[PDB]
């Protein structure tokens, strides 16, 4: 049948990796198919993926915030 | 003439710790100090184009940290 696949690195937060990924091997399940229910299950609630989608935002500009903040304290030591 | 303007100051923990630690044990008071940091450097161009850098960073550093510690107590009780 048509069941092709797509392939993508996907990097996580440490404590939060190491938990799903324990999750995932607590119950037999991948890290590709949780993500796939969430997703799902998610995308046919929507005023609850609404709130996912602004914490994940809310995450990438943590993200951001974490880089910039090595992007400086690296740019530091170059002069002290 | 001789005035004086009272700015409040908010300095980096460690380095703050640090510069009471020699003032105290140097009988300096660290305002002073500031006025003679700058008095020093501003006379040595290159080497005031370094402390500028370093300071350029030193706040890019902290306006950072500023954004992470403003998404995560947001994220806190969002839940």
Same mark, same amino acid.
């Given at each position: 049948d048509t069941f $092709? #696949?797509?392939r993508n690195t996907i990097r996580i937060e440490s404590e939060?990796? $190491?938990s799903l990924r324990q999750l995932c091997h607590? $119950?037999?399940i991948t890290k590709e198919t949780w993500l796939e229910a969430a997703y799902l299950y998610l995308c046919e =609630?929507? $005023?609850e993926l609404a709130q996912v989608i602004q914490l994940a935002q809310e995450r990438l500009?943590?993200?951001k915030?974490?880089?910039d903040y090595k992007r400086? =304290? #690296?740019m530091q030591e170059r002069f002290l």
């Open positions: $092709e #696949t797509v939060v990796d $190491e607590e $119950e037999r =609630k929507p $005023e500009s943590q993200r915030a974490i880089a400086a =304290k #690296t």
